[PDB]
């Protein structure tokens, strides 16, 4: 399973994940026995490599002929792909998909091999020792596609809420694999309503994007938390062959807009009742199956949340599909957490950030659940060099998506110099956990400073992180910190304060569940875990579960 | 995902599971909220139905035209299927697959609804209050198939090991949905080798089976735990339809006290494993299953026993591919004589055996068929039921051996029937007898005073409780250190017991049970796992791994 | 520490406990290591004997001359005492005190050895495999007393509440260790008020008791939960003394009422075993008070001593804090056949005799219990209940008596006690609504039993919970289920017309016997409101809300 829906009926495709591959470590001075191992999966979950860091090899066979495409939804975190023993592609960043295109391969059985690598080092500026694990392995799915002469790379649909109703445009990208000129047509339908026909002329080996006008969609019903209506959009490449290729995605008609201090969904003023959620599970690493995803979402919905924040990297497209279908709002951000100014000066940092953003928005553009793009969680936005990166990455996002609001979760308390750029100002604060200041006092001081002393003034404002730690099981009448009883007190006051802060659009609690972290963080991280889950790593509700549930269920999605 | 491989390239099929359906409980007078629930799944894992027992409705839409088949891999435990508001199908038993066939439906969008029921009462003779959970919901997958005039119902392949090498016969069942006579052909290949072309004749609306002969397979490599080579077998109906399954070339038979796999004397290093998980109920995804199997391989085990019911075919697929030997039994546990006298018992055991063996016939990992775990094999009425079910199996699968797990310590009157004698025993957990002494007294009784004398012998259950996290220097029962003492002695005795073929540890993980069993079941769990319900290893995990890993697959 | 107050100022005494003795197990052929072990203590808390059941030896030396007395407050459960190598004394039962008296021993250093034994078998009718632990060792204190020619063996003070106010009578037992006739006086004071001077005549080696008359005590303030005023009572033999503490309080039943100083009492109680993961049944002063402070924090006003007499230092603390005590002889759940053990009646009568003689003066003890959940539905059992009730009345004619029954509508012994008491477990062992279960049982007692019209207590109600096991399914053994159960249970008992109150089963989790493992997760009884480490379970708040919303009287 790759999506909750079929993205192709014309194109010949086959999933090569949901299978056992042969797995062995490489580059050790140990026995490198070959085992059978699941794809998707992480090798920290296989008994023999439970604390392995480095390189390992995944291999299987496939049968194909002609032009083919190999799509990897995620490889943790550095990949080398080899077909029949020849290097054919490479990738960095565990959380975005990439592909390999191979022209006119001999028929029959072929050998596929993926070297996955989760080493830390100078070549890796995003995956570093951090307050979340960098797993290893083929953590999301793999798809083999047999292509014709030319194929559809992506389709991007934008709805528009005009005075007279719903409009929309579509942009399609076509890649000519043939050395000759290509003439054809792309016909677009949305939900079996006729939309557009884009005539196609492509030179040899050219990839080109084509756009429709802004067209009426009087038949469209809107997407919202209360009514998450989705339509299948289908684009068909027609050439002298015939219906040669297709691409199918899903869209929701919804408008996300900022106006003053208001985040507006379909004209209504939005209240965020959110959770920060990592892709982490003690059996599945970051390769969580559909059943584990939906189990998280039912707990999150049971807590009364309307939104998730993808800390701190793009998410599996299966998960975003599930959020589309259930009306869950998504803050999605590029892969970065707490990188210093010196980390951002790594020779690869800008290129790696650029590649993450490009793949994230190119692949995830159509998800109506995504309402905001985040960047550079808690990076050095108080420095001049830090500002330079923020500026570039913000404007990279505008060039890819000129319509969704942008933001970045900050912790430079009253020293941020990058608040002028984004549409939404966002802050991570931990009064009552890391600081013994009353939550109301701390939040008021920060908020006045943003309104009076920063270029963030007048913009909508979110607390993108607040919460407290607690070790499940540890309970004492002393209510000391790390006890479940103290987490209850902390969250009750924290949620009371954010929901009472005039000008604040809501909150993401840090965080949904407990998370495995890197070993170097053990000094401040009991159990080598981040312990601020409202549910523990096995999804057992802590005492604070009821406190969060009482808060979130007592408020609606709108102001 | 339904199988680890594609079962169709010609038949038009689409998975209707791996999706959210609309869900609500039924049996009340007001508004019940409609929630979006995962299929496959158990409603005990949905926050608002965590302890619900009764009926509930699952529903979605699909697009289809003409003759269609809806295949349900598992609905826990009683199902009613309605298409476009009309009841079209029924099933009992949570653990066997079943299908609905509809002729010439109008084109377009249709409404599908499943009423799932996990209630207890007189209608249900297999799902009772018991020492495992009877979940509710669409706990395995659902497949839409668009059919034509006729379709291949199943295909059964049987390998035969002769003095000159491998042989095999195939038997195909074809169903004619047309009221006229059908003429056609069925082309069978195994691993892209030409096997047979059978001409077919079916009268109107008839279902008939057709067999090849025993043909030579000089190309076949064998299947074993060391080398689980598999082949795809393909059957194409030309009249337009196909069916694809997987086979291994391997021989299971008993001879004297020996269980022989390809003529080698087999040693079972097993775990009893329930389909139970704290997040997934009995509806475990591919990822969870492989996680269990990797732990089980890490423990040195070479076999699993499917306590106490048939298993997901995706799980059997994974065992085939990895060389894991499988004891699969019909759904029954610990039924007394009076439970077995329920007017539905014989029908429901018979339906379970027929659907189990017909659907699973080809898995090379399945080496034995079990029946009626700890049922009333000490009574005449019980013996009557054992006899019927043993002969039902022989009619469906005349080659694999049969057994049953007994707890009728020196009182069983049914040991003459099976190919293998199996006993569940718990010395050093329920009785403070030394294991060697308890197992010796049992073993000499079967041999000197029972009709099971001279047959192969397994310990199908042995083990001890341990609540994860409870440890004391006193080594009291339920402490993890006591499970260590108990499992060492237990495994040492079984592997040293002359005539015993091996052992299934009770059990792999901790398992949720029914509330009525709470009094003897701490946490309303079975705590005899070597890993707890969250798959964390107890202290005894090391003891089992040192034992199993010191031993190979054969004597 | 033996009591919270000094019991002698004239008598020469020294505590031999609060020390390390030499300890080794016996019953083997080789060399057993000798270790320095604590007395008081249980060997199940010593690392090398954590599961030891059998005999063991405890020994130390002492210095003494002349007539001496060795008082042993508790040896679990069968004791043999040797001085200088010679068998001098025997006891059975872990929970009652006993003494050895030695006439004119040579002066100097002496060897004392105690052989303790916690074996189960035919010689033991009370200590059996059961739903609590039979520990081994010198689990309570030990006192050396150096005596003269006679000594005061005990003193019993009884208050009487009359129209004009408080009266009292005292009874004193003097033991003559001399072979000749003895003459003297006994001078008794209560709270430095003059009380009585009794002239004493004892023949040779005679033990005789002497009674004062009922005398006015117009200075006496009364004892109660609200005001636990205590007085020291002093009896001086003229050469020897004995001191004890009394409270002026009247316990009475009248109709369906239990009256404490005329006020209708409401019991808000806990069953509490003498059990601690570190200290076995040998809990120090500090651990007792920690239990008592949690018990007061929960809003309770009473404890029930399941299922045996308690340390006198614990009883002392209950006197000082106004905690009402139900004390019972040592027995739990013996069947008719267990009761037909040939030592059963001897060992019950010894327990009742040692219990009431030692504890008579504790004003906190308001009722005497017997034979918890024994065979009160059989004729042989009713024979035993009958005997033990009348023995109690012969030793204590004034406090009410009872027994905790589980013979739900089959008890034939309800005619005997002053108070009818039942242990019931609806919503734990039976899925009946508590009010319906309690109403069915109550109407039967009123309409169909000889217990009709008498005061009525629920002496056990509660539910299991393994600390730390929590789930949204609220299954049994989860802490969330124990919350639900106790809420309904306490709602029902406190609303049951005719019911005087409740003892929750039980305060804390308790180690039990290995044979009970099948129904006892962790080989523990998990029905505590705190766990064995005194950590509060979720249901702690439920009990607190219930008990703190109710006073001590109706
Ligand atoms: O302290 C914490 O737990 C958090 O601190 C920051 O807010 C960071 O963004 C998180 O990743 C997490 O580490
Ligand atoms: O006691 C136990 O745990 C077991 O007893 C029997 O052996 C039964 O077959 C098991 O299902 C389980 O109930
Ligand atoms: O079930 C229980 O825990 C209780 O049963 C009886 O009421 C008995 O008096 C208690 O000692 C305890 O065993
Ligand atoms: Cl933390
Ligand atoms: Cl168990
Ligand atoms: Cl218990």
Residue C373 CA: which ligand 3 atom is closest?
Answer: 9
Match 């008359």 to its residue by tokens. C213
Query: C515 alpha carbon to ligand 3 midpoint, in Å?
Result: 15
B48 in contact with C, Cβ within 8 Å: no
Asked whether B295 and B538 are in contact (CB, 8 A), the reply is: no
Q: Is B305 close to ligand 2, i.e. is its CB under 6 Å away?
A: no
E strand or H helix that includes residue C291: helix C285-297
| Residues C517, B50: C-beta atoms closer than 8 Å | no
Omega prior to A421 cis, within 30 of 0? no
B103 CB-near residues (< 8 Å, 6+ apart): B67, B177
E strand or H helix that includes residue A500: helix A484-500
| Residues A473, C471: C-beta atoms closer than 8 Å | no
Please give the Cα distance from C458 to C445 (Å, whole number): 13
Distances in Å between the alpha carbon of A418 and those of A376, A381, C533?
A: 11, 6, 54
| Among the listed residues C304, C311, C308, C299, the one whose alpha carbon sits nearest the alpha carbon of residue C325 | C304
Please give the Cα distance from B369 to B356 (Å, whole number): 10
Please give the Cα distance from A132 to A123 (Å, whole number): 19
Q: Are residues C381 and C454 in the same domain?
A: yes
Omega prior to A280 cis, within 30 of 0? no
For residue B454 the two structure tokens come to 């001279």
Q: Which residues of B touch C473 (CB under 8 A)?
A: 44, 50-51
Pairing verdict, β C231-237 and C182-190: antiparallel
Instruction: Give the ranges where A347-479 is alpha helix by DSSP (H).
Output: 349-364, 384-400, 439-453
- Expressed as residue numbers, the domain containing C215 is 149-250
Ligand nearest to the CA of C526: 6
**Residue A442 DSSP symbol:** H
Q: Which of B44, B51, B476 sits opposite C523 (nearest CB)?
A: B476
Please give the Cα distance from C504 to C460 (Å, whole number): 5
Query: B287 alpha carbon to ligand 4 midpoint, in Å?
Result: 28
| Residues C469, B519: C-beta atoms closer than 8 Å | no
Vertex C17: Cα angle to C16 and C19 (nearest 5): 100
Q: Are residues B265 and B175 in the same domain?
A: no
For residue C17 the two structure tokens come to 């406990």
C492 CB-near residues (< 8 Å, 6+ apart): C434, C435, C438
Query: Å from B280 to nearest chain A CA?
Result: 7
Q: Dump the DSSP string for C214-233.
A: -EE-TTPPBP-SS----EEE
Given 3-state DSSP classes, what are the helix, strand and coil percentages for chain B, each rounded to the nearest 5?
Answer: 20, 35, 40
| Residues C522, B469: C-beta atoms closer than 8 Å | no
Q: Are residues A156 and A19 in the same domain?
A: no
For residue A399 the two structure tokens come to 């060039």
Match 């085939």 to its residue by tokens. B320
| Among the listed residues C421, C409, C414, the one whose alpha carbon sits nearest the alpha carbon of residue C499 | C421
Q: Which residues of C276-294 are buried (b: 16+ CB within 10 A; e: fewer)?
A: bbebbbbbbeeebeebbeb
Q: Binding site annotation covers C301? A: no
Residues in chain C: 554
Asked whether A544 and A488 are in contact (CB, 8 A), the reply is: yes
C473 in contact with A, Cβ within 8 Å: no
For residue B428 the two structure tokens come to 């050093």
Pairing verdict, β B303-305 and B325-329: parallel
Query: C129 alpha carbon to ligand 2 midpoint, in Å?
Result: 26
**Residue C446 DSSP symbol:** H
Q: Are residues B98 and B122 in the same domain?
A: yes
Breaks in chain B after (C-N > 2.5 angstroms): 239
B33 CB-near residues (< 8 Å, 6+ apart): B24, B48
B12 CB-near residues (< 8 Å, 6+ apart): B145, B146
Q: Binding site annotation covers C429? A: yes
Binding site members of B for alpha-D-galacturonate: 131, 308, 333, 373, 430, 461, 521, 526, 528
Residue to mutate (ligand 3; options C423, C466, C482, C502; most atoms within 8 A of CB) = C423
E strand or H helix that includes residue C103: strand C98-105
Pairing verdict, β C12-15 and C35-39: unpaired
| Residues C521, B477: C-beta atoms closer than 8 Å | no
| Among the listed residues B273, B238, B221, B232, the one whose alpha carbon sits nearest the alpha carbon of residue B3 | B232
C536 in contact with A, Cβ within 8 Å: yes
| Residues B518, C473: C-beta atoms closer than 8 Å | no
Instruction: Give the ranges where B335-420 is alpha helix by DSSP (H).
Output: 337-340, 345-360, 380-396
Q: Are residues C169 and C304 in the same domain?
A: no
Neighbours of A, requiring at least 3 CB pairs below 8 Å, are: B, C
The conformational region for residue B128 under phi > 0 = left, psi -120 to 50 = alpha, else beta, is beta
Method: X-ray
Q: Are residues A113 and A132 in the same domain?
A: yes
Q: Which of B291, B294, B534 sits opposite A538 (nearest CB)?
A: B534
- Domain final residue, candidates B115, B148, B181: B148
C286 in contact with B, Cβ within 8 Å: no
| Among the listed residues C419, C421, C437, C440, the one whose alpha carbon sits nearest the alpha carbon of residue C429 | C437
Q: Is B333 close to ligand 2, i.e. is its CB under 6 Å away?
A: yes
- Domain final residue, candidates C126, C148, C170: C148
**Residue B94 DSSP symbol:** S
Resolution (in Å) of the shown entry?
Answer: 2.2
Q: Are residues A94 and A222 in the same domain?
A: no
Q: Are residues C60 and C179 in the same domain?
A: no
Match 């909508």 to its residue by tokens. A460
Ligand nearest to the CA of A525: 4
Q: Are residues B480 and B532 in the same domain?
A: yes
C155 CB-near residues (< 8 Å, 6+ apart): C170, C171, C172, C173, C188, C233, C235, C242, C244, C361
In total, the C-beta contacts within 8 angstroms joining chain A to chain B are 82
| Residues B475, C521: C-beta atoms closer than 8 Å | no
Q: Which of C468, C472, C536 sits opposite A473 (nearest CB)?
A: C468
| Among the listed residues B485, B375, B507, B467, the one whose alpha carbon sits nearest the alpha carbon of residue B427 | B485
> In the 3-class helix/strand/coil scheme, how is A312-323 assigned residue by residue?
CCCCCHHHHHHH
**Residue B87 DSSP symbol:** E
For residue B524 the two structure tokens come to 């309303």
Q: How many domains would you assign to chain A?
A: 3
Query: How many C-beta atoms lie closer than 10 Å to residue B111's C-beta?
Result: 13
Query: Å from A537 to nearest chain C CA?
Result: 14
Ligand nearest to the CA of B308: 2
Closest residue, chain A, to B317 (C-alpha): A19
Please give the Cα distance from A393 to A389 (Å, whole number): 6
Asked whether B62 and B110 are in contact (CB, 8 A), the reply is: yes
Pairing verdict, β A504-509 and A272-276: parallel
> What is the SS3 assignment for A464?
strand
Please give the Cα distance from C493 to C507 (Å, whole number): 18
B471 in contact with C, Cβ within 8 Å: no
CA end-to-end distance (rounded Å), chain A: 38
Edge-to-edge strands, sheet with A262-265: A256-259, A262-265, A268-269
B474 in contact with C, Cβ within 8 Å: yes
Question: B176 exposed, middle or buried (CB, 10 Å; 0-12, 13-18, 19+)?
Answer: buried
Vertex C450: Cα angle to C449 and C456 (nearest 5): 85
Pairing verdict, β A66-72 and A19-26: unpaired
Please give the Cα distance from B396 to B214 (Å, whole number): 18
Please give the Cα distance from A70 to C520 (Å, whole number): 58
Q: Are residues B112 and B195 in the same domain?
A: no
Instruction: Give the ranges where B397-539 is alpha helix by DSSP (H).
Output: 435-449, 480-495
**Phi and psi at residue B76, to the nearest 5°:** -90, 115
**Residue B98 DSSP symbol:** E
Please give the Cα distance from C497 to C512 (Å, whole number): 35
For residue A486 the two structure tokens come to 């103290």
Q: Which residues of B touch C466 (CB under 8 A)?
A: 467, 522-523
Asked whether A279 and A332 are in contact (CB, 8 A), the reply is: no
Closest residue, chain B, to C526 (C-alpha): B522
Ligand nearest to the CA of C524: 6
Binding site members of B: 131, 308, 333, 373, 430, 461, 521, 526, 528
Sign of CA dihedral C436, C437, C438, C444: positive
> What is the SS3 assignment for B373?
strand
Closest residue, chain C, to A473 (C-alpha): C468
Please give the Cα distance from C350 to B52 (Å, whole number): 55
User: Which of A139, A283, A285 would you mutate first to test chain B, the one with the most B CBs within 10 A?
Assistant: A283
Asked whether A235 and A247 are in contact (CB, 8 A), the reply is: yes
The conformational region for residue C249 under phi > 0 = left, psi -120 to 50 = alpha, else beta, is beta
Beta bridge partners of A504: A461
Q: Which residues of A391-428 are buried (b: 16+ CB within 10 A; e: fewer)?
A: eebbebbeebbeebbbbbbbbbeeebbbbbbbbbbbbb
How far, in whole angstroms, is CA A18 from its chain's centroid?
21
Distances in Å between the alpha carbon of A168 and those of A233, A274, A375, B147, C509?
A: 12, 29, 27, 39, 68
Asked whether C456 and C499 are in contact (CB, 8 A), the reply is: yes
Q: Binding site annotation covers C221? A: no
- Domain final residue, candidates B232, B251, B270: B251
Distances in Å between the alpha carbon of C30 and those of B498, C26, C85, C114, C116?
A: 37, 10, 21, 20, 19
B36 in contact with A, Cβ within 8 Å: yes
Query: Å from A555 to nearest chain C CA?
Result: 23
Please give the Cα distance from C158 to C395 (Å, whole number): 12
Asked whether A111 and A70 are in contact (CB, 8 A), the reply is: no
Distances in Å between the alpha carbon of A539 and those of B101, B280, B354, C366?
A: 40, 12, 39, 50
Sign of CA dihedral B218, B224, B229, B235: positive
Q: Binding site annotation covers A465? A: yes
**Phi and psi at residue C432, to the nearest 5°:** -85, 140
Residues in chain B: 555
Please give the Cα distance from A450 to A416 (Å, whole number): 9
Q: Is A131 close to ligand 1, i.e. is its CB under 6 Å away?
A: yes
> What is the SS3 assignment for B166?
strand
Q: Are residues A241 and A273 in the same domain?
A: no
Asked whether C217 and C248 are in contact (CB, 8 A), the reply is: yes
Q: Are residues C179 and C95 in the same domain?
A: no
Q: Which residues of B touch A41 (CB under 8 A)?
A: 287, 290
**Residue B536 DSSP symbol:** P
Asked whether B211 and B171 are in contact (CB, 8 A), the reply is: yes
Pairing verdict, β C420-423 and C257-260: unpaired
| Residues B467, C522: C-beta atoms closer than 8 Å | yes
**Residue B33 DSSP symbol:** P
Sign of CA dihedral A332, A336, A341, A345: negative
Distances in Å between the alpha carbon of A266 and those of A227, B1, B449, C284?
A: 12, 37, 82, 70
Asked whether A354 and A393 are in contact (CB, 8 A), the reply is: yes
> In the 3-class helix/strand/coil scheme, how is A140-191 assigned residue by residue?
CCEEEEECCCEEEEEEEEEEEEECCEEEEEEEEEEEECCCCCEEEEEEEEEC
Closest residue, chain B, to A292 (C-alpha): B279
C470 in contact with A, Cβ within 8 Å: yes
Match 């401040």 to its residue by tokens. A524
Helix axes A349-364, A317-326, angle to 10 degrees: 40
CA end-to-end distance (rounded Å), chain B: 38
Ligand nearest to the CA of A537: 4
Query: How many C-beta atoms lie closer than 10 Å to residue C343's C-beta?
Result: 14
Structure-derived torsion over alpha carbons of residues A7, A9, A10, A15, reported in degrees to the nearest 10: 60
> What is the SS3 assignment for C282?
coil
Query: C510 alpha carbon to ligand 6 midpoint, in Å?
Result: 9
Q: Which residues of C touch A475 (CB under 8 A)?
A: 535
Match 């003895």 to its residue by tokens. C182
């Amino acid at each position: 399973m790759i999506r909750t829906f079929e993205t192709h009926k014309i194109r010949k495709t086959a999933e090569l994940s949901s299978a056992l591959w042969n797995f062995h470590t490489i580059g050790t001075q140990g026995e490198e026995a070959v085992i059978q191992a699941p794809v998707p999966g992480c090798w920290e979950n296989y008994p023999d490599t439970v604390s392995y860091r480095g390189q390992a090899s995944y291999s299987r066979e496939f049968e194909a002929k002609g032009n083919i495409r190999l799509e990897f939804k995620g490889v943790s975190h550095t990949a080398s792909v080899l077909v029949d023993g020849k290097p054919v592609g490479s990738h960095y960043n565990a959380y975005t998909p990439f592909d390999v295109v191979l022209k006119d391969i001999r028929p029959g059985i072929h050998q596929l091999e993926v070297i996955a690598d989760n080493s830390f080092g100078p070549d890796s500026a995003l995956h570093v020792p951090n307050d979340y694990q960098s797993y290893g392995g083929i953590s999301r799915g793999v798809v083999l596609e047999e292509l014709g002469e030319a194929y559809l790379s992506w389709i991007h649909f934008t709805p528009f809420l005009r005075k007279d109703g719903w409009y929309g445009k579509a942009e399609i990208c076509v890649r000519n694999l043939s050395s000759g000129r290509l003439d054809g047509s792309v016909e677009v339908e949305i939900g079996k309503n006729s939309f557009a026909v884009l005539p196609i002329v492509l030179e040899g080996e050219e990839e080109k994007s084509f756009s429709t006008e802004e067209l009426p969609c009087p038949w469209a019903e809107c997407w919202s938390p209360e009514s998450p209506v989705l339509y299948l959009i289908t684009a068909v490449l027609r050439t002298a062959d015939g219906a040669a290729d297709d691409i199918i995605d899903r869209v929701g008609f919804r408008e996300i807009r900022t106006e003053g201090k208001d985040i507006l969904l379909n004209g209504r003023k939005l209240r965020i009742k959110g959770f920060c959620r990592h892709e982490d599970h003690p059996q599945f690493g970051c390769a969580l199956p559909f059943s584990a995803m939906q189990h998280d979402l039912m707990l999150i919905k049971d807590l009364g949340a309307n939104s998730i924040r993808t800390v701190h990297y793009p998410n599996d497209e299966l998960f975003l599909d599930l959020c589309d279908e259930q009306g869950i709002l998504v803050w999605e951000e590029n892969h970065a957490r707490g990188l210093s100014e010196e980390n951002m000066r790594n020779p690869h940092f800008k290129q790696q950030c650029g590649d993450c953003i490009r793949e994230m928005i190119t692949a995830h553009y159509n998800h109506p659940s995504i309402y905001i793009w985040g960047i550079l969680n808690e990076c050095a936005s108080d420095t001049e060099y830090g500002r330079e990166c923020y500026s570039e990455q913000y404007e990279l996002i505008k060039s890819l998506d000129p319509y969704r609001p942008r933001s970045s979760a900050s912790c430079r308390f009253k020293t941020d110099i990058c608040l002028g750029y984004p549409e939404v100002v966002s802050y991570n604060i931990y009064p009552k956990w890391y600081h013994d200041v009353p939550v109301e006092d701390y939040l008021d001081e920060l908020y006045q400073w943003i309104q009076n002393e920063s270029e963030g003034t007048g913009k909508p404002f979110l607390i993108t992180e607040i919460g407290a730690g607690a070790i499940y099981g540890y309970r004492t009448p002393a209510h000391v910190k790390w006890s479940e009883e103290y987490q209850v007190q902390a969250l009750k006051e924290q949620l009371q304060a954010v929901f009472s802060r005039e000008g604040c659009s809501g909150v993401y609690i840090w965080q949904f569940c407990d998370v495995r972290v890197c070993d170097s963080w053990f000094g401040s991280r009991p159990r080598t875990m981040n312990n601020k889950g409202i549910v523990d790593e096995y999804r057992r509700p802590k005492l604070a579960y009821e406190v969060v549930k009482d808060s979130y269920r007592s408020l609606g999605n709108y102001f």
